[PDB]
Amino acid sequence: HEHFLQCLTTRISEPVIYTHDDPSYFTVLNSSINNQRFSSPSAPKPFVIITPFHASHVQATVFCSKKHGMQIRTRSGGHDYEGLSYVSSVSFVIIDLRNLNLINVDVESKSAWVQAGATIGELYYRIAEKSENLAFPAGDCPGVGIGGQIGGGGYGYLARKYGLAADNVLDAEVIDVKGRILDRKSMGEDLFWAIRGGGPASFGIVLSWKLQLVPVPSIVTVFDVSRHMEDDTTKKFVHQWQRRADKVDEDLSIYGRFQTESSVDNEGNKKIVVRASFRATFHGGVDRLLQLMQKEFPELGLLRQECHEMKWAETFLFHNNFRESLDVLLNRKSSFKAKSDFVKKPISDDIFEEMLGKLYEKVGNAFIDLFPLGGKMNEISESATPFPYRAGNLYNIHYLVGWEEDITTSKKHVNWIRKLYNYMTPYVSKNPRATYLNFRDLDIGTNNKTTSSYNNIARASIWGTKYFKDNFYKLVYVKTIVDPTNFFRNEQSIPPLRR
């Protein structure tokens, strides 16, 4: 290891390098660990953490890590569901891109250059600073890094209108295994295809994205309402949501969320209730929204007083529960296990109720979310990016169980969510069991940790066709061309073919 440090110190003439002895190391490590499952002192720790300010800091780290057999994990926002950006089973270093967060918005060309350590929140602020009529389709969690979110797709309220973030990328700059800086034209269309939704950690290190900005009106409308599950109107609305939320006007995206809570009846007897919440952004005015809901979802009974008009960028305040705050908050804590599925056929009302009934074992700390697809998603080819789940997909269902990290509670929580996943098997898509890469899940399979490349590819196709369906085979080809020695690897990285 000492040679590796001398290599770095010689190539990075300097705070860029943080060692175990440096007192800021643990602060910089824990700073962007966002699933506390992996913050334990027993979790594996990086030998060093690099916080580059320049692309040559990354170039030096790649050279030295290759020369001395260190594994790199790239970290942008640190939101990886399985912590793959900051844990490894081998000796590793973290390249943490937090300092490469510069953003250049150009209104006349409707485009922005964005360094890959910028957060979603930072990007939205920088857009609003220059124009209330421009946006970019991405998630709504403002702490998420642009590097990983675009890297695996990037879904949100504008997806039904404009597609995934990965569908709205014009150019990019990447470092490959040979230390070269490439952009779209010099890297080729195949690698430019692979990094937009295929998990860039398999192929190199993305340094920046060139984004295509999209039009939005000056005023949009939001709501976040609760409804009573025992009312027939609520049950019809969920029935109708399953059949219609992917088919309504592309300006409207309605999410659903379900959870249980502890309550009491009128007599004071303890009772568990299911709470149903529906939250939405309509890219339009409130009167048009209300006419639309009466036409398509009258059973929700949406009230004018539940709707709120604002500028597009303020919806991320509302949807993150900043409901006085300035946009500047976008410039600024638990352990969880999550899983997810794609649904191609409406789940019958009785099975949906049995699925909700599993929440009675996990009161207050488990959530089922429903995200609608269709719209623009149906018009985009399944091989336009590595994300393949377009036409034929009605919605994504997302399961989550959370807890506070304090010791067998963890195993009981993970066990519960697996059985719910196993219960859903017959009613969700299959062959492959479609999975959204940005909801990473190691349970669906991991790589060999050395056998032949044939066996590596056969094993990796278990998880690989779940994330990518048929696009997995093109991904293996790109990996074979651009990283034949398999330097950039992790528990779920595309393997190359060898001779």
Ligand SMILES: *Cc1cc2c(nc3c(=O)[nH]c(=O)nc-3n2C[C@H](O)[C@H](O)[C@H](O)COP(=O)(O)OP(=O)(O)OC[C@H]2O[C@@H](n3cnc4c(N)ncnc43)[C@H](O)[C@@H]2O)c(*)c1C
């Ligand atoms: C925690 C969290 C995640 C969310 C949230 N909301 C989302 C939403 O509304 N829509 C979505 O589509 N996804 C949402 N997600 C999930 C995130 O999209 C994914 O979890 C992202 O992968 C997270 O990105 P990032 O914050 O950058 O996480 P990292 O752990 O740093 O990276 C993930 C993954 O990608 C590799 N990688 C990152 N950056 C690079 C670069 N520049 N080059 C190469 N490889 C890179 C990492 O190595 C890792 O493997 C809401 C919340 C609260």
